[PDB]
Design an enzyme around this catalytic site. Structure first.
Site, mmCIF file in Angstrom:
data_model
loop_
_atom_site.group_PDB
_atom_site.id
_atom_site.type_symbol
_atom_site.label_atom_id
_atom_site.label_comp_id
_atom_site.label_asym_id
_atom_site.label_seq_id
_atom_site.Cartn_x
_atom_site.Cartn_y
_atom_site.Cartn_z
ATOM 1 N N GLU A 35 68.203 -11.044 -71.213
ATOM 2 C CA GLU A 35 68.214 -12.499 -71.212
ATOM 3 C C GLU A 35 68.279 -13.014 -69.784
ATOM 4 O OE1 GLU A 35 67.354 -14.616 -73.092
ATOM 5 O OE2 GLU A 35 67.356 -13.603 -75.046
ATOM 6 N N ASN A 46 62.160 -24.286 -70.914
ATOM 7 C CA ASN A 46 61.268 -23.995 -72.021
ATOM 8 C C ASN A 46 60.134 -25.002 -72.027
ATOM 9 O OD1 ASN A 46 62.911 -21.819 -73.091
ATOM 10 N ND2 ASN A 46 64.340 -23.418 -73.780
ATOM 11 N N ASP A 48 59.281 -26.922 -74.369
ATOM 12 C CA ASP A 48 59.663 -28.151 -75.057
ATOM 13 C C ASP A 48 60.636 -28.952 -74.223
ATOM 14 O OD1 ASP A 48 62.066 -26.730 -75.350
ATOM 15 O OD2 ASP A 48 62.388 -27.476 -77.388
ATOM 16 N N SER A 50 63.398 -28.196 -72.958
ATOM 17 C CA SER A 50 64.781 -27.750 -72.982
ATOM 18 C C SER A 50 64.959 -26.649 -71.934
ATOM 19 C CB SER A 50 65.189 -27.253 -74.369
ATOM 20 O OG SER A 50 64.658 -25.974 -74.625
ATOM 21 N N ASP A 52 67.307 -23.015 -70.924
ATOM 22 C CA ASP A 52 68.174 -21.940 -71.338
ATOM 23 C C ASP A 52 69.117 -21.675 -70.162
ATOM 24 O OD1 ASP A 52 66.731 -21.875 -73.719
ATOM 25 O OD2 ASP A 52 65.729 -19.985 -73.342
ATOM 26 N N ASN A 59 70.423 -22.053 -75.168
ATOM 27 C CA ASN A 59 69.432 -23.122 -75.175
ATOM 28 C C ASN A 59 70.035 -24.503 -75.482
ATOM 29 O OD1 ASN A 59 66.975 -24.715 -76.132
ATOM 30 N ND2 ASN A 59 67.787 -24.049 -78.119
#
Length: 129
Positions: A35, A46, A48, A50, A52, A59
């Site tokens: 990760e 991301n 969209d 957003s 992380d 997220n």
């Protein structure tokens, strides 16, 4: 902070991740590896919009607030920037809720893709846990 493999294992053990929801220490430590490569300040955006955050790349659409992800819940009652701390406590506790959500560790895509179905137990060898 960038964690070591066993350092993080141990500091995840002491936070009640080892065998949490049925997922041995190995998994968790495998997931973090892919990760965020064990980096606590790791962020990724991301498509969209957003973002992380964290060693576990939590997220913002669901779990934390960073105040520029419109139409997001904040289901871990924390500012997202609390997930960048060298004290993964916040990351643990919020992951614990994510992993109870019901999809299991499948939430973290890296895990599902790269750790699921592997000898996760190898990620805690040599570590005095």
């Amino acid at each position: 902070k960038v964690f070591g493999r066993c350092e993080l294992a141990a500091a995840m053990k002491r936070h009640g991740l080892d065998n949490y929801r049925g997922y041995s220490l190995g998994n968790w430590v495998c997931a973090a590896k892919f990760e965020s490569n064990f980096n606590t300040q790791a962020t990724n955006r991301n498509t969209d919009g957003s973002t992380d955050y964290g060693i576990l790349q939590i997220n913002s659409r669901w779990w934390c607030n960073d105040g520029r992800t419109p139409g997001s819940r904040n289901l871990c009652n924390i500012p997202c920037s609390a997930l960048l701390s060298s004290d993964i406590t916040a990351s643990v506790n919020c992951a614990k809720k994510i992993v109870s959500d019901g999809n299991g560790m499948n939430a973290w895509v890296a895990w599902r893709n790269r750790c699921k179905g592997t000898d996760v137990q190898a990620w805690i060898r040599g570590c005095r846990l």
